[PDB]
Amino acid sequence: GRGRGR
Amino acid sequence: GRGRGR
Amino acid sequence: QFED
Amino acid sequence: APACMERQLEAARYRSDGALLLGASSLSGRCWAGSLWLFKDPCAAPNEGFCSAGVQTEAGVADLTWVGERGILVASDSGAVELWELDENETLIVSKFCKYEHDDIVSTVSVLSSGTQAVSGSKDICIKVWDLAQQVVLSSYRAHAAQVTCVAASPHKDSVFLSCSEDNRILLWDTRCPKPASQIGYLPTSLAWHPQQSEVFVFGDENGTVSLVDTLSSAVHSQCVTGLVFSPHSVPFLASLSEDCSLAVLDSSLSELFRSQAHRDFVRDATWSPLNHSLLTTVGWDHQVVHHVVP
Amino acid sequence: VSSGRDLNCVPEIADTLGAVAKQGFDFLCMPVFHPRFKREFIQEPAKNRPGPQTRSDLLLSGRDWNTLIVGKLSPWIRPDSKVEKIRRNSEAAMLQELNFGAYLGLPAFLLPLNQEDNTNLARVLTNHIHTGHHSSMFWMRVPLVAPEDLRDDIIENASGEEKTWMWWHNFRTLCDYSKRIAVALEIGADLPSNHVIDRWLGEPIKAAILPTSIFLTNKKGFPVLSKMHQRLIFRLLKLEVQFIITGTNHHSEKEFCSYLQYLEYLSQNRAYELFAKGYEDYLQSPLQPLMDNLESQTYEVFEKDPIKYSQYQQAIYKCLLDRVPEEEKDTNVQVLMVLGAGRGPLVNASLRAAKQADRRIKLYAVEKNPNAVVTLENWQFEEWGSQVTVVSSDMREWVAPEKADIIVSELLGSFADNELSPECLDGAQHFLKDDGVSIPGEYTSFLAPISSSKLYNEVRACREKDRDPEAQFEMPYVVRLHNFHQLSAPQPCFTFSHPNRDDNNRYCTLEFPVEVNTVLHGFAGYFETVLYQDITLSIRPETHSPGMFSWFPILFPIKQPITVREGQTICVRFWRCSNSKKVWYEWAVTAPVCSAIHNPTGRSYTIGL
Amino acid sequence: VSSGRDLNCVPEIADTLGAVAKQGFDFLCMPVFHPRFKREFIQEPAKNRPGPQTRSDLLLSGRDWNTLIVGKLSPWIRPDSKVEKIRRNSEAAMLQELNFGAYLGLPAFLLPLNQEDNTNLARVLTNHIHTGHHSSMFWMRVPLVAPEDLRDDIIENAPTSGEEKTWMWWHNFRTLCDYSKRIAVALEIGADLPSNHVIDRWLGEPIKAAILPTSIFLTNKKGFPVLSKMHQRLIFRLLKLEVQFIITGTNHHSEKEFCSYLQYLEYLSQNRYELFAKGYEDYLQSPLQPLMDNLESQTYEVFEKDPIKYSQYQQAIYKCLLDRVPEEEKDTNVQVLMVLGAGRGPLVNASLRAAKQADRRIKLYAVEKNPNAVVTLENWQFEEWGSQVTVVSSDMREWVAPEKADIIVSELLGSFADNELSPECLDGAQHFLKDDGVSIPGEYTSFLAPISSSKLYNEVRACREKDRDPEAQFEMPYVVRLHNFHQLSAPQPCFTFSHPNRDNNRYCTLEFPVEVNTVLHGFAGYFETVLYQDITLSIRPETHSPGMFSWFPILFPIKQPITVREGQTICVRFWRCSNSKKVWYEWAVTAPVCSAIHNPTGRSYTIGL
Ligand SMILES: Nc1ncnc2c1ncn2[C@@H]1O[C@H](CO)[C@@H](O)[C@H]1O
Ligand SMILES: Nc1ncnc2c1ncn2[C@@H]1O[C@H](CO)[C@@H](O)[C@H]1O
């Protein structure tokens, strides 16, 4: 999970 | 797959 | 050491 | 001389001596190589024991011609145009050049009328004119839009030749012209110049129809016409080969005179005998060299 | 560079594979049957041709077949021939060769797209894909320039650049955008324009085919490439395609290792990219910090961005300087309220800013996450002391003991308001003084229309059971889109300013002038935010804050792609909808053709208040 | 051996992991909150207790929390208390601890099953599992012997389902939580072990860890910790399942250190077909269908990497050739052998070298319908066999033979001996057999045994797919290497086929005397085959051919598990049903309780003719 995502 | 199975 |  | 020749005999040529040249390639099994075989006793073909000369080539043998009397110009599947030369005793076949200058399978080779220049059509869409003396390409031409099926050198004018391709074009080429090609307005599959009439050629298409063109038609076969050969007579007969495993000999009006179904696979090359002008040797992919007597 | 050798003549297969590996190629594209060994399936006697039809399986090991060999279809196989016998033989032979490649377990298989009508080829491929179990990939060999446009002008008596893309588009549309059908692109001597290369770059290009004929010759004789060709190779190396070298060695003085060595040379001469690597075109789901409690690892991913928190610290620095003059420095205490304090990087930014501004602050760290409150309260016990007051409450329902001079929050998402920053800061502005400041001061979202066929296949692959079978097209996806094509420049959608002193429901109509023929696949959403006066954070692809990887773009898909041509304008409507319980987005394309309204009533995606 | 240390006292966590890792343990079971720090959630003033509720997450790295720590629920948390205030406080606190473990990203979390009623515990765990996204596993710490049966008999007026008590605790818990994949067993091994049948029911359970107190360790003559013979036997059986071992308690051999308790297990591990089946244990597969689906080259490679089966066919052909040509007729009698479904050619080579070692003359036919295996067969014939072997590319059922056969040899046997249509294929391959002709194999029988396995049941449920009946996965046989399962009764024969047969629909009723309490999850199918008189191949687990790994057992699941008691027989009925196009199986349990008929009309699984 990276960039404000799960 | 082994044992006559895919 | 490892013998019953 | 290999121990055995391959099943798919691809070409057969009668030189003026009357000796036969077989080009074969294995199109199946472990090794896709080719081989050349000179049979000066033509009735003994294709038995590898009774051969005058033989050689193994590095790849397939898609097509071949005679460059004069002791030259064998081969189209290889490796993009090679190669020149094999018989020795003085006609016992060995020896390579002079092997130029890899086509980018895919060279599908056809024809020798121009001077005998010192050749043409080569390939599956790379490029048609090359070669100078056989200096072993170079004089001129490459990307004028088709699809792979070249046949190139046919004129027997009369050295620069003039013909080509057909999968883009449904029959170009007529004059090498000395500034724009050398001009279109002679189903896909054509084979070409043949008329041996005497300088402006006349026949061509066979992928539906089995042989047509005659002035620079006539006939549903000779059921599948594509693989090759079209003319007899050495004063009034030539036309031998038509096809993928329906059939041979048909036609007269000057494309009316059928002879039909042979001796082949159990594709019929690849026919050649009329220079000695017995009624004899017609056809080879096939069933390893069968059939000699016919044409009425 | 992973690269391959495309040979159409393999006399012995083990020797040829050995020589190819000696030259340095990773795979080898080769015909599984003999290219000239035309086969009959209908007519006797040639239907009954004896003997083996091709080579043995046993000539290479199993792992050799599955990792080293890319199969090729024979050139005589024309399933779309106008002659019925030819096309039936070609259907049967294409089936035979595809089944032999499936049997050999080849990783890939090259098929040619060299004419406009390829419908029967598409049907035979689609029937192979749906028959049996097999996992080979199908690389459709299509040129950049059609071969009838590359031919020389030497014939005496005898859509230009967008031809072969429409060949590929028709093929992949007939085959229903399969995951197993990709592109092998042929790069010829003549190279098309920049926008043709952009649609192509948006495609599933798994390999690139470089003939040796397109290579130029230098003063030392080695093969090189033109500057436009080098640019194209760099753009393709961004995609990590495999380069296939075809044709014969035109630089016969040198080896065939030289064409490969030039590509290795270009490869060795090509923070956000290192972070985003491994996440390209990988669809996450956007975080919902208000409705879901995050994890330690999520917060840790947040706090590995020094640029964003340096920006917040600079904004607080400038605001503290503005609100307190130098003469009132030691007697004026500024109440800062960090709303959604997290594990505490905003609180540390505020403390460091008040040190740097050299002003006295009384700070509140509000956080509704009961598990991050543990971290905040251990921070408070050890480091912060009595300066920071940790509140374990929602900023909306928390009753403050005083008003705030500044409220600071990091509640922004990839679309700037999909994490309910307006609704959280709306309920958190009653404990702000009448001259109070909110950091971020305002934030805008920006949308651009995009084409990406891989992203469309990823969204299709997100079809989950026990829900609407097309509800994956009505969710935004946090995605590091890589293999895409942006059709038009981003335009602002929604703007929220805080404090709001005057409805968070919004409606926007955006008209995007497209100058190129394309196929719209979705909308990519970015944001900008003004924290304080000249201090901004942006994820827009032009004004992007450098090295700031907190936010990936957001993606709103559309259910069916919309074909667009040049001069048209894509008109799209975006709504921000809400009720007492939920907030969602709805979208619909209205020009050039209408789409359905996506996510009505939040049926596929809501953000929980 | 991968082992952990269960500590219930961690003064400082970093020092404690250091001391635990020096001793050799791989993880650490520890309390995430203080085990004595009881917390109030409903009632003032202790509800509003200030400060952090526990220690921070920043004391270890994220990778340390996600790999090294197994969390424990605090001992005072009794969600099934009879006092409602205690019950509600324990629900709230267990939710708090579970959510904090999810926040920390712990891989596992220990919860105690130390009493009969654990229904509120099961509900709070079920609601945690379905709330949010988290991937921690839940190890129910259940004793092998209940704690009120391990008590001393030292109470003057209270002298001391006895051995099957705690298993019913676990069964009730996992049934309430609906057989979750994320709930497994951590088993406590006391000084008193139960019987061998009780230990077998546990060995069919999802045991992910085994608690070994230091008090069950005996003492040798040199003073080191050792284990009794029954304890060593249990450790060996649990080492088969690859569970982890948790050492609990204090050092009861104070001269040495916990390295000694760990070194005994690390010693006892090294003093422990199975290599082929690594990684395939409890991994469901689809049974092969060679008649309908064309096998890959690699499938044939796995077939042919078994030398025992092909040696057995070669010996059977040897013996049949001897008993068919007397040595006076040795040099003039040619035996027509027909290898049916010749494959890539191992049965043909077996026939050739069998006739070679029998000194008899054979004319051999290799019939194969796979065109791609026919390619290999024809290359074999061209290069090796020559005119001795005639390769036929046909289906043995509609092949027209030029002559009749003395022997037909086939390997059309599946894991249930007839699930690959060997009867139907050898029915059509029988008219070109002589009136005194032999078939190899001439006999084959299938065997069924009832099994229990929670893991296999969860794998079958995990095989649910969309665009399908939601319980179709329970009406399919699976070729699976049965590892974590319990077999309830000895196998009994189901169906028998003999060739030549001078109707293949079958119906069998099998009663299994189940001498133990269990829960039925499916049936395991094996087979025996008589190739020639004394030459047999068997995968039946009591007469298994040694080293012969060509076949894994079949599993026929049932849709709902059937609880079985002591002395209750299990009646199952199988059907081999067929029509002109399809062959399938149907099964139903009819005692102790009926189940539905599984796979009616072949709606979920047919073998295609
Ligand atoms: N209403 C709220 N009150 C307090 N913290 C919040 C609120 N909404 C979100 N947060 C926190 O804000 C941070 C980023 O969204 C996270 O720590 C999240 O828990
Ligand atoms: N009816 C059949 N005729 C010929 N070969 C068969 C037939 N059924 C199965 N086989 C072959 O038997 C082998 C294993 O069953 C495979 O090689 C498969 O292709």
Author numbering:
A (entry chain D), B (entry chain L): 71 to 76
C (entry chain K): 5 to 8
D (entry chain B): 23 to 207, 213 to 242, 249 to 328
E (entry chain A): 14 to 171, 180 to 291, 296 to 527, 531 to 637
F (entry chain I): 14 to 173, 180 to 291, 297 to 526, 531 to 637
List sentences quoted exactly from the publication behind this structure.
Both biochemical and structural studies indicate that PRMT5 and MEP50 exist as a stable complex of four heterodimers, which recruits four pICln molecules through direct interaction with PRMT5. PRMT5 (previously termed JBP1), the catalytic component of the complex, belongs to type II protein methyltransferases and generates monomethyl arginines (MMA) as intermediates and symmetric dimethyl arginines (sDMA) as final products.
Clear EM density was observed for PRMT5 and MEP50, and for only a few residues of the PRMT5 binding motif (PBM) in pICln. The remaining parts of pICln, most of Lsm11 and the entire Lsm10 were disordered, providing no structural information about the interaction between the Lsm10/Lsm11 heterodimer and pICln. PRMT5 and MEP50 form a heterooctamer of four tightly bound heterodimers, consistent with previous structural studies of the methylosome by X-ray crystallography and cryo-EM. We observed EM density consistent with a peptide segment in the active site of PRMT5. After examining many possibilities, residues 71-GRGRGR-76 in the amino-terminal extension of Lsm11 were chosen as the most likely interpretation of this density. The six-residue peptide of Lsm11 bound to the active site of PRMT5 assumes the conformation of a type II reverse turn, with the Arg residue ready for methylation located at the third position of the turn between two glycines in the primary sequence. Therefore, the current structure suggests that a GRG motif may be preferred for the methylation site, and a GRA motif could also be accommodated.
